[PDB]
Amino acid sequence: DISTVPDETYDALKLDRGKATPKETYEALVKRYKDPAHGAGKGTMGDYWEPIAISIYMDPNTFYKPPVSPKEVAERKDCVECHSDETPVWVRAWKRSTHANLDKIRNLKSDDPLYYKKGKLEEVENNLRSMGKLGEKETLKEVGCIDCHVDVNKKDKADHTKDIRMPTADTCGTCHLREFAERESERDTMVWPNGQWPAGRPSHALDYTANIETTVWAAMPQREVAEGCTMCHTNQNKCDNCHTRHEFSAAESRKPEACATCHSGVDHNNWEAYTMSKHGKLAEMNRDKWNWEVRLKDAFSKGGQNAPTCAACHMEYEGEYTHNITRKTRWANYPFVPGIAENITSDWSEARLDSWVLTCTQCHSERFARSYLDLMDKGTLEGLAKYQEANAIVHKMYEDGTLTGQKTNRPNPPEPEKPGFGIFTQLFWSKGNNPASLELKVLEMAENNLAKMHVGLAHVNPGGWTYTEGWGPMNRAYVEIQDEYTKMQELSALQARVNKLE
Amino acid sequence: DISTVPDETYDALKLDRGKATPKETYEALVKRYKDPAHGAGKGTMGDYWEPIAISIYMDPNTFYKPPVSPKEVAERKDCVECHSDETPVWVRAWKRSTHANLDKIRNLKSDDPLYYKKGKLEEVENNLRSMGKLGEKETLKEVGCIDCHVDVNKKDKADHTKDIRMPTADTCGTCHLREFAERESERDTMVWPNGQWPAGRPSHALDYTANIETTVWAAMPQREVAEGCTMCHTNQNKCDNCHTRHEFSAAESRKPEACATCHSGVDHNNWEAYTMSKHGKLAEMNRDKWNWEVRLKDAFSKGGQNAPTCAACHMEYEGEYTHNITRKTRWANYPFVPGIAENITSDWSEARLDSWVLTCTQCHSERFARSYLDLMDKGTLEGLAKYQEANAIVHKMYEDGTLTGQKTNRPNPPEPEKPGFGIFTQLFWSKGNNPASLELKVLEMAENNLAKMHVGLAHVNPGGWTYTEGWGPMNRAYVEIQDEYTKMQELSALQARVNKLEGK
Amino acid sequence: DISTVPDETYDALKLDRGKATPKETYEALVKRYKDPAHGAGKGTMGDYWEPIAISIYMDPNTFYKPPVSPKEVAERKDCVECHSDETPVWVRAWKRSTHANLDKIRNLKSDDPLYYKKGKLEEVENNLRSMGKLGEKETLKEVGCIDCHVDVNKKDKADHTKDIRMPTADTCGTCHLREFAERESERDTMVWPNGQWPAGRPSHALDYTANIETTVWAAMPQREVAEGCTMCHTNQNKCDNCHTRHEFSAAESRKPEACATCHSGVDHNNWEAYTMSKHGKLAEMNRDKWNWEVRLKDAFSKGGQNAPTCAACHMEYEGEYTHNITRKTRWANYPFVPGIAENITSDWSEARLDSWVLTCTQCHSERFARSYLDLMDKGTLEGLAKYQEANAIVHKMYEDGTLTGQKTNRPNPPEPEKPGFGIFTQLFWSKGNNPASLELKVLEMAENNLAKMHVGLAHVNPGGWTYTEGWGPMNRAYVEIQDEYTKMQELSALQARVNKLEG
Amino acid sequence: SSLAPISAKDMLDYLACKDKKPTDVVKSHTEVENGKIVRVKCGDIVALVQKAREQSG
Amino acid sequence: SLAPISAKDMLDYLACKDKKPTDVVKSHTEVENGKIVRVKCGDIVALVQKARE
Amino acid sequence: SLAPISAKDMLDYLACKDKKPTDVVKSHTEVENGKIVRVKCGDIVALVQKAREQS
Ligand code: HEC
Ligand code: HEC
Ligand code: HEC
Ligand code: HEC
Ligand code: HEC
Ligand code: HEC
Numbered sequence A: 001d002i003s004t005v006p007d008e009t010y011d012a013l014k015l016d017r018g019k020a021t022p023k024e025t026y027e028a029l030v031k032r033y034k035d036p037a038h039g040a041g042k043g044t045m046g047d048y049w050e051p052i053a054i055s056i057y058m059d060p061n062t063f064y065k066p067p068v069s070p071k072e073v074a075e076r077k078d079c080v081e082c083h084s085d086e087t088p089v090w091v092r093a094w095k096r097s098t099h100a101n102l103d104k105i106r107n108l109k110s111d112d113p114l115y116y117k118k119g120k121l122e123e124v125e126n127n128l129r130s131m132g133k134l135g136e137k138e139t140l141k142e143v144g145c146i147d148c149h150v151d152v153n154k155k156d157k158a159d160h161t162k163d164i165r166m167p168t169a170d171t172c173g174t175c176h177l178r179e180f181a182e183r184e185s186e187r188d189t190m191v192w193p194n195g196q197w198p199a200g201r202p203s204h205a206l207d208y209t210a211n212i213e214t215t216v217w218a219a220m221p222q223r224e225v226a227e228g229c230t231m232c233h234t235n236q237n238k239c240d241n242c243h244t245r246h247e248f249s250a251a252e253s254r255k256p257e258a259c260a261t262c263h264s265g266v267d268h269n270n271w272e273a274y275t276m277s278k279h280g281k282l283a284e285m286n287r288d289k290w291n292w293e294v295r296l297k298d299a300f301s302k303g304g305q306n307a308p309t310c311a312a313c314h315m316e317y318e319g320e321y322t323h324n325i326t327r328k329t330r331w332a333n334y335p336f337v338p339g340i341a342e343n344i345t346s347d348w349s350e351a352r353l354d355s356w357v358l359t360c361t362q363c364h365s366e367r368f369a370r371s372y373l374d375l376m377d378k379g380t381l382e383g384l385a386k387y388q389e390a391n392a393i394v395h396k397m398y399e400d401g402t403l404t405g406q407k408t409n410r411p412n413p414p415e416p417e418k419p420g421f422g423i424f425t426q427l428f429w430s431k432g433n434n435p436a437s438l439e440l441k442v443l444e445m446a447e448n449n450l451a452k453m454h455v456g457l458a459h460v461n462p463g464g465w466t467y468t469e470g471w472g473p474m475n476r477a478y479v480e481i482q483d484e485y486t487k488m489q490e491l492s493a494l495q496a497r498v499n500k501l502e
Numbered sequence B: 001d002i003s004t005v006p007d008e009t010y011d012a013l014k015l016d017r018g019k020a021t022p023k024e025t026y027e028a029l030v031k032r033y034k035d036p037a038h039g040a041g042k043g044t045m046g047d048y049w050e051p052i053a054i055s056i057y058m059d060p061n062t063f064y065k066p067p068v069s070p071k072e073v074a075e076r077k078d079c080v081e082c083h084s085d086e087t088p089v090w091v092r093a094w095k096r097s098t099h100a101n102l103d104k105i106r107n108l109k110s111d112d113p114l115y116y117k118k119g120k121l122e123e124v125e126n127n128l129r130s131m132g133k134l135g136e137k138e139t140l141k142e143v144g145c146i147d148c149h150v151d152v153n154k155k156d157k158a159d160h161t162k163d164i165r166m167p168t169a170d171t172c173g174t175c176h177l178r179e180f181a182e183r184e185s186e187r188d189t190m191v192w193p194n195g196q197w198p199a200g201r202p203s204h205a206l207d208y209t210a211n212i213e214t215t216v217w218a219a220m221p222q223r224e225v226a227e228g229c230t231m232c233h234t235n236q237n238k239c240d241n242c243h244t245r246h247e248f249s250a251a252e253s254r255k256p257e258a259c260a261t262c263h264s265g266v267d268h269n270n271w272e273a274y275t276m277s278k279h280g281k282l283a284e285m286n287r288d289k290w291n292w293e294v295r296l297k298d299a300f301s302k303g304g305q306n307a308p309t310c311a312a313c314h315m316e317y318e319g320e321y322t323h324n325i326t327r328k329t330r331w332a333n334y335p336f337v338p339g340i341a342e343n344i345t346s347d348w349s350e351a352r353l354d355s356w357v358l359t360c361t362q363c364h365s366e367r368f369a370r371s372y373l374d375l376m377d378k379g380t381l382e383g384l385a386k387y388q389e390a391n392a393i394v395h396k397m398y399e400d401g402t403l404t405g406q407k408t409n410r411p412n413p414p415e416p417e418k419p420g421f422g423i424f425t426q427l428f429w430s431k432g433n434n435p436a437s438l439e440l441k442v443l444e445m446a447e448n449n450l451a452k453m454h455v456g457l458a459h460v461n462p463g464g465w466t467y468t469e470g471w472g473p474m475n476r477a478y479v480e481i482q483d484e485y486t487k488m489q490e491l492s493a494l495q496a497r498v499n500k501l502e503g504k
Numbered sequence C: 001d002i003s004t005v006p007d008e009t010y011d012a013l014k015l016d017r018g019k020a021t022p023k024e025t026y027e028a029l030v031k032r033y034k035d036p037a038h039g040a041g042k043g044t045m046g047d048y049w050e051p052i053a054i055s056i057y058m059d060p061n062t063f064y065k066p067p068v069s070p071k072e073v074a075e076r077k078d079c080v081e082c083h084s085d086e087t088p089v090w091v092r093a094w095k096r097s098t099h100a101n102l103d104k105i106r107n108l109k110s111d112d113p114l115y116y117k118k119g120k121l122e123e124v125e126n127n128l129r130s131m132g133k134l135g136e137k138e139t140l141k142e143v144g145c146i147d148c149h150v151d152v153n154k155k156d157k158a159d160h161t162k163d164i165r166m167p168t169a170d171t172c173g174t175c176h177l178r179e180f181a182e183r184e185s186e187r188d189t190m191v192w193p194n195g196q197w198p199a200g201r202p203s204h205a206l207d208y209t210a211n212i213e214t215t216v217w218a219a220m221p222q223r224e225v226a227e228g229c230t231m232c233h234t235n236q237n238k239c240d241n242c243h244t245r246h247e248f249s250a251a252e253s254r255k256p257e258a259c260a261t262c263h264s265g266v267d268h269n270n271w272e273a274y275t276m277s278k279h280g281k282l283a284e285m286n287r288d289k290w291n292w293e294v295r296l297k298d299a300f301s302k303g304g305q306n307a308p309t310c311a312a313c314h315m316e317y318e319g320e321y322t323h324n325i326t327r328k329t330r331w332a333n334y335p336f337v338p339g340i341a342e343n344i345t346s347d348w349s350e351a352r353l354d355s356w357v358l359t360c361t362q363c364h365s366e367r368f369a370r371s372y373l374d375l376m377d378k379g380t381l382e383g384l385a386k387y388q389e390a391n392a393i394v395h396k397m398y399e400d401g402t403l404t405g406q407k408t409n410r411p412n413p414p415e416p417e418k419p420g421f422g423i424f425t426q427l428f429w430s431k432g433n434n435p436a437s438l439e440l441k442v443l444e445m446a447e448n449n450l451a452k453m454h455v456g457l458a459h460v461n462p463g464g465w466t467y468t469e470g471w472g473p474m475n476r477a478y479v480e481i482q483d484e485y486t487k488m489q490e491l492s493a494l495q496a497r498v499n500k501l502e503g
Numbered sequence D: 001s002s003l004a005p006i007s008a009k010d011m012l013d014y015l016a017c018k019d020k021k022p023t024d025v026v027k028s029h030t031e032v033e034n035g036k037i038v039r040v041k042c043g044d045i046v047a048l049v050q051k052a053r054e055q056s057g
Numbered sequence E: 001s002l003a004p005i006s007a008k009d010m011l012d013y014l015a016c017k018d019k020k021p022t023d024v025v026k027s028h029t030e031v032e033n034g035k036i037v038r039v040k041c042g043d044i045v046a047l048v049q050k051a052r053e
Numbered sequence F: 001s002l003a004p005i006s007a008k009d010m011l012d013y014l015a016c017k018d019k020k021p022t023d024v025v026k027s028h029t030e031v032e033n034g035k036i037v038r039v040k041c042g043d044i045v046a047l048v049q050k051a052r053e054q055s
């Protein structure tokens, strides 16, 4: 039993909450995790793309084989000693990490704010004993190279050409069952009432699957470009994107910067919106005054934190903190997704709003919190309506067949993509007049500018939904859409007059 | 008397600064502050807009009513005890703040770099005695929840459903008379010689008034979008935008990040330009070497500051630091505003330029400072000239009525706005071909890119007035304006040739 | 001998490594440094532009003359005393600096990680003895105001109106011969196999020369705009852009922020790409765990640094660290430059690729480093192919003469610039339909979007070559080029159908 | 099953009519016609939504 | 109300400070026939004076 | 001076830089008829070698 893992997760794994051992729960988790039907492997469109060099580090469970050159047979001590010359900083980073200083964790006295780590260590040891990798009274001495990269608690020899692996999520989940089960519970908690998104999405548990199930990603010839998408979509495969290798610092993963590399840009400017807001600017100003080493539960008390951070807001749910980040999602970044706006009034959304208010009321009053979140919802819908009116114009041109080069120069997208109007593929693939300018513009109006508007609203950045992002750019898009439509009408009217003379 | 407060402020309130008591000064300040004719309330266009839920916090003196629940009567102690569970962090932030630890200010020694605070506490106490809020031998024990949110130095029971307020600028200015009067003096100091801007503007003193007196803000139906503008324009109403609630750290307000949320973006990228400059990059590198808790006048000595910050440059005037940020303004962000460019050579601006040089001489030589401010001035004019040439083209098309949809699809803006060419409304409202793309492009050329060019120039960010902002994007707008103008000329020339084929 | 300086520098200086004195090496450096033929002065287009007020600080050796007032004469002490209230912070920043606390550097212990500075002080003193500025037994007391602004180790009175100078690269080079020589060695090490760029470029050694040798910069009337470019191109002239005045902290120059003011923007978003990457975000998150005072050679060990920084990657070459940043350059930011893409497979680029692998292997494995550098190269090329296809369209239109206003409203660029297609001038100068919108669009597709795509790839920012920068923006330009192209073809087809009815 | 499509303006007008009578008239949050913000009767928008809510389930 | 003067004319006025009426300066903004427009200082001072008066 | 080689030709050459002239690879850049263009390695290597010969 894990106290922070949802009931519907155990139900999905077909496990009893009171009669399930850490070994059985792990085995049920990995069985679903490594199953091609549940998202593992190359995906439905694997016959259209091949791995490049870096892909073995992006999807190790599918593509990774150990290197052939170092024909070596090594032991635990050999890993640290040889790689001190081969990858020095990797050794130095591991040396100062908690994984290598487990005795420090046992020396933690109960008046030290980091004391919870001792309980987590004992929890890790508990899990390993259940599986048979650790003796009942044997203490885990260290988490070294050979543990993650070969096998946990291994003392015998390892073939550098046969036994070396890239540590995936299940590898980390051997010791860290709680966090791995919390992460994998997103498959069961992120279920939309009307199938607005596929079951379990959006989530960190199925981010790679989403990536490889995107048609343009699989279809496009530019593998090196497409692999840029993969680098942001690796949380399914590896656990080192917030707390990185080889220090694996929890304090690091708690800082807003840890989410920035992926949660930024034209279609989700979360880093840009947050940092520019009072919440984020205060976080930048007071990062020295806070204790990041303290966990999220005690962040606002022992940590001294007086402004919210990405992890503090998104990992909190009904008073508890887990690696699950889905249970409060209502808008899911893209407000134009069918069913999302219609769902905003449902009891399902209202209960998730109540959970958000609970988060806000740690600092603000409920009246204040519910006031601004009312503004976030309506402002978002206000942005959506602006796009919907502009989309009605361009979509009417598509149905009439009047878009520039729609019948003269509109080549079909790469297999297995089907040609259509305002499809995602048109953002990463273009040839001739597929897409048209107006088509791309209204696509970017929703995908980029409407998304950023909502992100600005959700993360309290005034300029992020008015002047700079959101309303401002959407105003320009609407105007330019309307301008081109009127221009293409009076040109059609002129062309008809020329036809009236022939 | 308050030494930092200008003479023109007392002249507007009809007060003799020599004999005028703190109570009289405060009363005359608030008298103007809460007066609709001077900017308070909903403004001239109030009948066209209604508050939303968050407006009760954005403009409390007009919209705030205490919550109906809980139906409870509370005392000073009760405020802290209950909200310790209800809004736990707000009590926690207040606890570790100065307002809750006034004894720590009395115990300040003469060798301590923060000793000036004890004199500020004594000045605050003297203000409250004059107003009758404090006894003559009574000392201010704390600044707690009941003080700001109900009444200063309250000793009796308070009703949560009737007596609770959102602390406005006059609420803070009850004790902090100096800073409140320093801020209100912007109404009197910021006066343009030829009426370039409304009197007292631009300023933090009238930022909400300016917001609600903007036609599109009152006219537009997207209230939640409109309130995003309001959130950047609340300095008039509340004093927690630089030094935030509930810690109210003065050190925090001195940091460049405190100004960033508002002074950033497409029409004034001050944060972007400053951070990317050497000044701002140094500030990010040296922030742990500086003492932020030290006051601004000792910042470069006792603090150890060697790179300038937003607060240090803009609050400084003639060697002294003051909540008035208006006294050195010459360009006022938007270089296209009529009169501004023509006023840059006046004695009024030249005197204010002397004041800026003074600010710069804290580090640079006068020669160096006058060399770069000459660049800022001429460069800003060079960007303005590029806009004016492009605007001539688009304006000609408006006069000729040849803009796309000008005669076929140009619906009127929402009331009480009136149709025009390249008006601010067209940035927050659009329907049909109002505005047209060319009309919007030239509007943004001035409003966004010319504005950012000056900011880049004013805040020493080379890429911010050349490649990335300013000259680059303006070049593009000029290029695209000229390109469309030619296209439409030869399209109407072709249209005329088709008309000749219909004469036959 | 300075072992960090390459052989070809001494060869170009016509000097023997082991025989040349510090005085001889300096003077030969300055001889090339101050020579108009080698890049100094106003350049080839000097008769087209005049200095502005700030130009005396941007290029002192050409433009600087001391101020007429104050008419004052002063000793070493009087420099500090008067400027203590005249320029208060400059004095304080100098007082905090190492240049004012030389005795503290002498008292440094051998086990201290900052001990190398004592060796550098004696290194400086050895240079000054050779040049006859310091006695054989005499030690340097301080590096003060009179030293850099008048003359090194002056012991008498100075005239504020005639003797005051702005400290250029040769001023700093008098003492810091190593770093001056290392920086000037870029002239000799940055030689492209097929002349892709001019010899010794791109580099900090010739950044001002490159600036003034750009036609628009000299040709455009907007001098104040033009000097904005100058402010990012002053490393040749002055040494205070990474380690600023008047603290002159080497620890400051090691911080990524020191490169940002120049290495950022639409045509090279290095700062944006690096900081948004894992490398750069970790540098933001862990900047207090790292000892920045530690030299770049020890940063990854004694400093505690676990993520790479601008300086660490670009100043490292084959296990060394020098003020030369040119010896691993293969793409040089702009991937569209003729010969660059074709050279990426040569032995020359492959050797520089191996040098890059060395830099990455300090942390990552060779298999990983080569895997990503391969992605970088192919991705950059995939970006170049996208641009090239778009350019083939717009270039065709120019040659056909069909661009908007090409034969109607295309005024000539200012002298001495010649008219052309998609020339750099059209980014900083425009009049009439010169350039046309399509022309400028494809110009910016190469200059801005393609360059930013490479930078994002080179600096490991996933969104910086996909959605936000590079591919995303290039997709839009391509679409808009193709859309306008078809529109103008349809317009031309309608043009011909009207002309038929008129015949 | 799947939700019936409702435009954002109709979603805004519906939310604007929360805690209000069917005869109460509210301003649109998005629509402007003839130089004025379009007024919406709360009864009509609640009927418009209730019709769509029944056009799927 | 201050009389309207264009930015280019403001630059030309600045370029003619402490200069003779017969002196000729370059424009800061204008290019004609592939050359920076030269401006006689007597013309720009007269244009500014007639606006202020 | 090196003879001009297009970016797409550099990719196709790099994709073939290991294998046989009779082998077929996918393009990194080209899409025709709703499919990625298939490139014969003999065609691309000969195109590069006849360009390097012009030097
Ligand atoms: C793969 C599924 C993952 C494993 C296994 C672990 N992580 Fe994370 N992580 C993140 C945050 C914001 C925290 C702090 C949580 C809190 O304070 O309550 C953590 C913490 C951990 C810990 C505990 C370390 C400690 O001693 O406090 C473990 C054992 C752990 N994580 C393992 C952030 C993220 C994240 C970004 C969203 C991802 C994708 C993961 N963590 C993934 C895994
Ligand atoms: C000792 C001999 C020195 C040195 C090395 C410097 N000063 Fe001075 N200085 C003084 C004043 C009033 C100025 C400002 C002049 C102006 O802005 O017009 C300066 C300027 C400088 C500079 C910068 C020059 C420039 O071109 O910007 C420099 C590098 C400098 N000083 C160095 C005043 C005085 C004195 C009057 C009492 C004395 C004595 C000094 N300074 C001494 C020195
Ligand atoms: C068993 C041998 C482990 C494996 C495999 C991994 N980790 Fe671990 N880790 C382990 C223990 C016993 C502890 C101490 C208890 C605790 O939770 O702190 C840790 C520590 C961490 C931390 C916290 C470090 C800190 O900030 O002080 C993190 C963030 C962490 N571990 C993450 C992590 C990841 C991502 C792993 C997969 C590659 C991983 N660990 C493997 C034991 C073991
Ligand atoms: C518990 C019994 C309380 C005591 C004693 C006091 N307050 Fe309170 N307060 C309480 C609750 C549960 C709430 C939330 C109401 C909501 O719907 O959000 C509040 C709210 C406030 C607020 C903010 C009101 C708003 O408009 O958002 C303030 C400023 C406030 N309370 C202050 C305050 C003061 C000064 C008190 C002492 C006299 C006090 N509260 C007592 C619960 C309780
Ligand atoms: C009277 C009871 C007060 C009211 C109402 C407000 N403040 Fe205050 N504050 C008061 C005193 C006696 C002091 C200590 C003296 C000093 O000025 O330092 C303060 C402190 C502050 C500070 C400085 C805190 C620090 O950085 O150490 C700030 C920035 C401040 N006060 C601002 C402020 C604001 C915004 C208020 C309105 C909500 C406000 N104060 C109310 C007395 C009183
Ligand atoms: C770039 C793209 C891309 C390149 C082409 C591919 C294939 C993806 C795939 C997706 C999918 C699918 C979604 C929607 C979620 C789902 O389940 O179907 C999209 C989301 C996404 C997010 C979440 C945004 C939110 O909800 O706030 C984030 C953080 C993304 C970021 C990466 C990114 C890093 C900068 C890059 C590159 C891409 N994505 Fe994505 N992704 N993604 N993405």
Ligand code: HEC
Pocket: A462, A463, A466, A467, B201, B202, B203, B210, B211, B212, B214, B216, B217, B226, B228, B229, B230, B232, B233, B261, B262, B263, B264, B265, B268, B332, B333, B334, B428
């Ligand atoms: C967005 C807009 C907006 C939304 C619609 C409204 C109504 C305003 C109002 C104004 C006014 C008026 C001005 C000009 C000043 C005046 O008194 O007449 C404008 C100024 C402004 C600045 C000052 C720029 C300078 O001079 O340096 C700042 C910092 C503002 C920023 C906010 C902003 C936060 C990002 C948002 C949203 C808006 N404004 Fe404003 N405002 N504003 N503004």
Ligand code: HEC
Pocket: B462, B463, B464, B466, B467, C197, C201, C202, C203, C210, C211, C212, C214, C216, C217, C226, C228, C229, C230, C232, C233, C261, C262, C263, C264, C265, C268, C332, C333, C334, C428
């Ligand atoms: C803006 C421009 C500019 C203004 C009109 C001028 C004249 C220059 C000159 C150059 C040239 C030329 C180059 C190419 C290099 C060479 O020798 O011929 C260009 C490069 C350049 C870089 C290097 C980019 C890289 O990674 O290779 C950098 C850092 C800049 C920086 C400044 C700048 C940053 C905000 C501004 C202003 C300009 N440049 Fe430049 N320069 N430059 N530049």
Ligand SMILES: [K+]
Pocket: A288, B288, C288
């Ligand atoms: K810090």
